[PDB]
From a paper:
[name] ([name]) is a mitochondrial membrane–associated metabolic enzyme, which catalyzes the oxidation of l-2-hydroxyglutarate (l-2-HG) to 2-oxoglutarate (2-OG). [name] belongs to the d-amino acid oxidase (DAAO) family of the FAD-dependent proteins. Like other members of the DAAO family, dmL2HGDH is composed of the FAD-binding domain and the substrate-binding domain. The active site of dmL2HGDH is located at the interface of the FAD-binding domain and the substrate-binding domain and is composed of residues from both domains.
Crystallization of dmL2HGDH in the absence of any ligands yielded crystals in FAD-bound form (dmL2HGDHFAD) and in complex with FAD and SO42− (dmL2HGDHFAD+SO4) in which SO42− was derived from the crystallization solution. Structures of dmL2HGDH in FAD-bound form and in complex with FAD and SO42− or 2-OG were determined at resolutions of 2.85 Å, 2.30 Å, and 2.82 Å, respectively. Structural comparison of dmL2HGDH in FAD-bound form and in complex with FAD and 2-OG shows that the 2-OG binding at the active site does not induce notable conformational changes of the residues involved in the FAD and ligand binding (RMSD of ∼0.37 Å for 412 aligned Cα atoms). In all structures, there are four dmL2HGDH monomers forming a tetramer in the asymmetric unit. The four monomers share almost identical conformation and are related by noncrystallographic 222 symmetry. In each monomer, there are an FAD bound at the active site and a detergent molecule n-dodecyl-β-d-maltopyranoside (DDM) on a surface groove. The FAD molecule is apparently derived from the expression system. In all structures, an FAD molecule is bound at the FAD-binding site, which adopts an elongated conformation with the isoalloxazine moiety pointing toward the substrate-binding site and forming extensive hydrophilic and hydrophobic interactions with the surrounding residues. On the si-face of the isoalloxazine moiety, the N5, O4, and N3 atoms form several hydrogen bonds with the main chains and side chains of Ser88 and Val90; on the re-face of the isoalloxazine moiety, the N3 atom forms hydrogen bonds with the side chain of His92. On the other hand, the A–B (or C–D) interface is mediated by both hydrophilic and hydrophobic interactions as well as a disulfide bond formed by two Cys77 residues.
Residue numbers in the entry:
A (entry chain B): 42 to 219, 225 to 413, 417 to 420, 422 to 453
B (entry chain A): 41 to 97, 99 to 144, 146 to 161, 164 to 168, 170 to 176, 178 to 219, 224 to 454
C (entry chain D): 42 to 66, 68 to 219, 223 to 453
D (entry chain C): 41 to 151, 153 to 204, 206 to 217, 225 to 226, 228 to 242, 244 to 412, 419 to 450, 452 to 453
The structure:
């Protein structure tokens, strides 16, 4: 019924299916999503920041796609008239040990050609954020905030305006050979036949790849990202984004202060090991989803080296008074009575056999069903670089299937 | 939009109640809010699918609603032209004590289950044995499809079904109550509210002012699928003689409209409200069910019964020794594990399992109170008695909400 | 240093050591890890002296019981050890239990149990006026005793003939050095004992000690806690003797029985609950090393495949004692939950093969090869039930087994 | 009726008090009731055997008063009875400039009338420990190595030679107005204290004392350095610990037999006598976790306690911290050794008790629920304080 279908209604799958039919309008492209609407998981529960590209090492792939995607996104928001607020980004250092890291993020950010990056001292910190302390800060006024869930839906809008079809409530559960390939949903009779596919399963990147002939690695390890909602009384204390100086050994950016479109400013997210693939709450646990997460060889290797950082993140979440004490190192005007537990997101972090966290493209196919391409990982961050990542995925697909 | 009445629940009880209230009053502006993407996505979409004739329940309301609902169901199935098969039920006894309990025959004759005969005798079910009761008016149907037709009739009467509407907060506003969904900006204004939340009967009732009791204790009903190489060994429904102390009818043989033979369901306590799998655990929803005062009181009396259900689930080989008492030519190789349903069992603070109607509301004569009525439980079988209990739910809200 | 070492100060190890020194007046020592002898199974038992009623006629388990019973009474009177000889009344609950009790009557008189006599009706009131039932089986020769006190007398006779008892000696390792090739190391540093041959009756650790020589993991020791209930002193007059239920013949467990102790107390038990620890006498005692290994045993998965229902039954009645009372009221109905109290417990050293069966026979095992430790250290990994009553008979069997394995 | 005074607990505290009591009044009928077979089978038998100089303790405090006095009393007792010991330096070593500040406060608090407190510079470090690095350090040569289990046996040896140690006596309930044991018939009546280490809270509840202060077991795990490199550690090597906790941190310490133990750490034991990780007790966890003060301390000190468990789960991380002192140790050079359990008392607000705590019901009983640290070196000094409190409550 179709030529190629994209499995995944996330911002990556929507932007890829959009980009491929814009350049090739003669291709019947469909999209299968297991949920009611688009961007229900990662791209629907994010902090909503358009990143400038500072943390990523120059000359790498992630440093190029982020800077290119940040300009492609801003140009896309004006064409579609999507609301967005360009607020300041302050990477504030609190002691003499973090400014050395801040000085590395300084030279690393300038090499990526981020627009108008300045390094302010403690005197000018209140000039951008009057309520924030710090020894030194890094100001990136080009960063902005946007609802990536609305951005994801606008991708699907332009997708089917060119002839696409978005099949929502379609839980892909099996691939069969009959248009040679055939896709089967969770409901009986719900089936779609095509020639090739391209999956962007996000949190189920590996499980979709296990139903074609790909190995278990790289396994998707769920990391919950919890947020705290500051009360409306003190929303004026944060004008823009206030980021901390993170540990460069991990891709996590740490809990930060971030405003949103609805005037709400949120505190987060953290790095909490989710005991469930879609474990948005701490109580929700799946025994089968962690027996494999524990029997995975790479998990024991990462835990052998980085168990202390994951447990202290879980410590600051068990007792939020510890998290407040950390946030007071930046804005000491916030107490435990000025916040309340909000929603959270889960990160689909890839992991190899050695325990490293993957931050690179991971395409895989079977060893008819083989030669079905699975995008098991995309470079961070997937939201800002979405349009740039889409073009790169729109190049891998045309050589794997000859379009 | 603004409405007169709002029904929270896309199940067979919420849809039939919403369908009944608009047929009696076509001038009403009634809406339906369902948190899932389709009607009958839980209990009404994960059931055995057999239409009961009320042979186990006389003089009460459940025995009247089931037989009346069974007659109204066959009339609705023929009017809307929905496929159904009169498979017939065969309640077989095995031991000598089960013969005394089956002599269930007197209660079924009083309830006027038509063509009820005490049978064992012969295999005129060929492969079934044992030392029985036949009622050929018991049939099977897709109750999930029946629920969709209730929504089709409700939409044809001017009603709107809001899907993906996860009700999360009732606040005060001509339409003095407003309803908040999960997504920001999802708002519906109404005058009076009726909730049929099924597995979330108590949680929805808590957002108005109702007490914790009765609590909804999840009981997962796992099913085993007899493979196609032996589906011919069961022609109609073959039920065992159950313990009258529990509403669970025990693991039974039941054919489906697609020709498959399903074996079940059992009674395994789910570690989650929507725990359809054995491993899915919600520590919050688990601790509250156990810390509920009525749970330990019920566990102190019948935990051995629930443990044998779990043991037959952990080791399937123990389950077939029971099934071999009815059909001995079934091995461990002829069956596979299938899907499951979770029962919204209501339980009081004393431990007794609720089986009657439970309507609850607020207290202090406010706006959220008196205008939001919660159906915390409906008599079983809910699917078969759906058209029957919908008439009594419509009568309840007509009195409670004053409708013309 | 010594010619023979018997590790384990239980009733089986002390009887074998006492027997082996009387026949060969040999430098033999006894190593016990605990403070005193009979600190486990020999000191945490029902204290009943059985006659061969339940056991198969003509088998070794049935011969040893009546042989050890007659040897015990002769030994109790010889050493002036206090013992009370009441009766064991096995009552049937329903007609289905009358069929099993009829077989136990024929199975008991075949092994010469003096003197079996079936009773029924109002005759049950003549022996126990508070207990009911359809039919019963009377055994006037069944008595009670302090098996822990009996075990200490075995070591008393063992020391009265030149034997040395090593207390607080936790055997940790078996190494080789001659003339005494095998030395035995303890938990404390420097504590060592050299010997020519070693015999191990470790009870709950018979498989762990055998693993330190070269013996396989099977048969594994699976701990089964046996909890007791204390009948209040206000109703201890309601039971005059031993009231036993007819047990399932598939399991060696005799079932929760009414049993008086010689201090006047009436204990109701024991049950058969799986222990989360080899020496887990309480409900909360959990050792993850011993828990996560009893589950990884191949026989444990096979045994639970067929008898998990009987085990969860025992556990459910252990969590809610009201269920246990409803079972005991089928015999003496005037007992309620207010008339009981949680008491101490014992742990059975139940051996299990790889197929899941509970072995109840003699299991001797030595190391592999012609080395020093493999040919001089013999492990008794299981003894026939009951080890306490059959102690004198088991000791003679073990003594003959040692006389052949080591040529003394 | 048999004895006049009964000391429940045969640890180093119970043995020293019973020994001190009979020397003052040789006419008293005194007995010691120990649950285990030998004396010093628990806390006193499972320690680093260090005679503490007393450098961490604030001046003018009671803990600093008994430590400096008990250390001198212990050195006189070891020579009087000819007990083997070795006087090696402790050498408090620092790392970064942030650790030098706390090391400077340790030198000021010590100069508590500590003897011969010299501050090593850096090049002189190799003259005391040639394999240890660091920036600055604080030396004190009169610290000692000792078998505290051997000393406890000598305390009871004198007590038994001055007029009875009842071993295997698990004191159960209470009834010369009777002390019951675990075995039926095991009895002994007295006219007048308990010093149970990990059970001072449970013994007090047998006569009507409140649950507070509770005893929270903290397992102290040790690591045995390989015998092939048992020469890199000549004396003690202690890190600069966080002053908010009584734990001195994992340290290098040699034993009488030449072995060197690395530790102990502070890992929450899941059992009162939980000497290994897998040994847990559910009843003793609903005790500690449901305790009101435990949640208060956990809400403030969970991060430090979680990293301790992380270093215990993976020695991978533990040696990475030890290499900051001597960097010539690998993973194959270490091996998991034995451990001890700390009888840390905790009040209802979460604070860790560090002073004397005596509580009675009902009048003839007196439970020393806690004693100042370190109880091993302060054994003779603390015993003098316990003997003064029991004489007043009218010997
Ligand atoms: C807490 C959090 C905060 C973040 N904040 C930011 C930020 O501030 N800025 C930024 O640039 N990035 C941010 N990100 C990253 C960004 O959200 C993700 O990188 C991006 O959404 C990845 O796109 P995706 O489509 O792969 O994710 P997803 O949206 O999760 O894509 C997966 C989709 O596939 C569907 N699916 C899965 N399995 C199947 C199946 N079998 N059949 C059919 N459909 C299936 C899922 O339902 C889902 O819709 C954040 C991520 C997290 C977790
Ligand atoms: C395993 C099993 C087998 C059964 N077999 C039979 C049989 O053979 N024959 C028979 O007659 N009966 C049978 N039944 C009974 C029958 O299925 C139920 O009685 C019936 O489905 C009850 O109707 P309901 O509306 O409560 O269903 P439900 O679907 O459970 O109704 C609850 C609905 O409300 C929605 N909801 C909950 N909370 C919210 C919220 N906050 N906001 C919005 N929506 C919300 C849920 O998504 C759901 O759609 C069976 C039941 C079970 C569990
Ligand atoms: C609850 C219960 C009730 C019973 N009731 C009865 C009854 O009524 N009548 C009856 O006849 N029988 C009864 N028995 C059975 C009888 O008690 C046992 O069969 C018998 O006690 C076991 O003898 P043993 O010598 O093997 O025992 P144990 O006493 O268990 O012997 C093991 C000994 O080995 C020692 N040991 C272990 N490892 C080492 C080591 N490394 N170094 C040194 N020493 C070590 C232990 O300390 C211990 O003392 C009962 C058993 C139980 C559990
Ligand atoms: C890991 C660790 C390392 C240490 N290192 C050092 C060090 O280097 N230097 C230093 O000076 N100090 C050190 N200490 C401190 C010192 O070892 C202890 O503080 C000291 O032993 C406490 O004395 P105690 O008698 O109360 O202890 P314990 O020896 O525990 O005394 C309690 C005794 O009473 C018995 N008992 C308990 N309940 C009962 C009962 N009901 N009936 C009968 N008997 C009972 C117990 O069996 C035990 O023998 C260390 C402590 C620990 C835990
Ligand atoms: C499964 C077990 C293994 C777990 C896997 C490994 C997980 C690793 C997660 C690393 C921690 C998350 O990322 C971490 O966030 C914290 C908290 O914001 C940052 O912390 C930083 O900012 C916070 C406030 O925001 C300051 O109080 C803090 O002093 C500073 O270090 C770290 O710089 C960053 O490294
Ligand atoms: C607090 C939580 C603890 C659990 C609470 C109590 C839960 C009670 C569970 C009841 C068990 C389910 O319901 C029970 O099903 C079993 C097994 O199908 C039926 O059992 C019947 O049919 C089976 C075959 O299916 C026959 O082998 C059996 O001999 C017969 O009794 C029981 O008659 C019925 O009572
Ligand atoms: C870990 C997985 C495996 C679990 C282990 C399974 C072990 C098997 C358990 C056997 C149970 C103990 O042994 C069992 O005791 C019970 C209770 O006393 C006896 O039961 C008998 O007496 C009791 C009262 O005492 C009566 O209420 C009962 O009707 C009668 O049958 C059984 O006849 C006997 O079989
Ligand atoms: C129950 C949950 C809460 C747990 C309760 C609170 C437990 C508190 C324990 C704190 C940790 C133990 O004590 C802590 O030991 C560590 C490790 O040795 C010391 O750490 C010090 O020495 C180590 C080496 O040993 C160095 O690598 C480290 O850089 C240095 O800081 C800390 O200075 C001390 O504070």
């Amino acid at each position: 019924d179709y030529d190629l279908v994209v499995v995944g209604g996330g911002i990556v799958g929507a932007a890829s299916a959009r980009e491929i039919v814009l350049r090739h309008p003669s291709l019947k492209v469909a999209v299968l999503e297991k949920e009611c609407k688009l961007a229900k998981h990662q791209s629907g529960h994010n902090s909503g920041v358009i990143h400038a590209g500072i943390y990523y090492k120059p000359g790498t792939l992630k440093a190029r796609l982020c800077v290119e995607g940040m300009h492609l996104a801003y140009a896309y928001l004006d064409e579609k008239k999507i609301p967005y607020k360009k607020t300041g980004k302050l990477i504030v250092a609190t002691d003499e040990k973090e400014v050395k890291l801040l000085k590395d993020l300084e030279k690393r950010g300038i090499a990526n050609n981020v627009p108008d990056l300045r390094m302010i001292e403690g005197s000018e910190i209140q000039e951008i954020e009057p309520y924030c302390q710090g020894v030194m800060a890094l100001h990136s006024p080009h960063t902005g905030i946007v609802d990536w869930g609305l951005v994801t839906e606008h991708y699907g809008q332009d997708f089917k305006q060119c002839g696409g079809d978005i099949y929502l409530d379609f839980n892909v559960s099996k691939f069969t050979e009959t248009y040679p390939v055939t896709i089967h949903g969770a409901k009986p009779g719900q089936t779609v036949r095509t020639k090739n596919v391209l999956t962007c399963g996000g949190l189920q990147s590996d499980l979709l790849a296990e139903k074609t002939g790909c190995p278990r690695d790289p396994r998707i390890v769920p990391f919950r990202g919890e947020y705290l909602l500051l009360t409306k009384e003190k929303q004026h204390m944060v004008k823009g984004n206030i980021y901390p100086v993170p540990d460069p050994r991990f891709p996590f950016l740490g809990v930060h202060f971030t405003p949103r479109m609805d005037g709400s400013i949120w505190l987060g997210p953290n790095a909490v090991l989710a005991l469930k693939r879609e474990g948005y709450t701490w109580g929700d646990i799946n025994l089968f989803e962690l027996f494999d997460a524990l029997r995975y060889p790479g998990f024991v290797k990462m835990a052998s080296k980085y168990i202390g950082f994951g447990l202290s993140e879980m410590s600051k979440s068990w007792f939020i008074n510890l998290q407040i004490k950390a946030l007071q190192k930046y804005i000491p005007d916030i107490t435990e009575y000025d916040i309340q537990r909000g929603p959270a997101g889960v990160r689909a972090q890839a992991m190899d056999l050695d325990g490293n966290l993957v931050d690179d493209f991971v395409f895989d196919r079977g060893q008819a069903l083989a030669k079905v391409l699975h995008c098991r990982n995309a470079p961070s961050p997937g939201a800002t670089s979405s349009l740039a990542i889409a073009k790169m995925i729109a190049d891998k697909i045309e050589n794997e299937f000859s379009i």
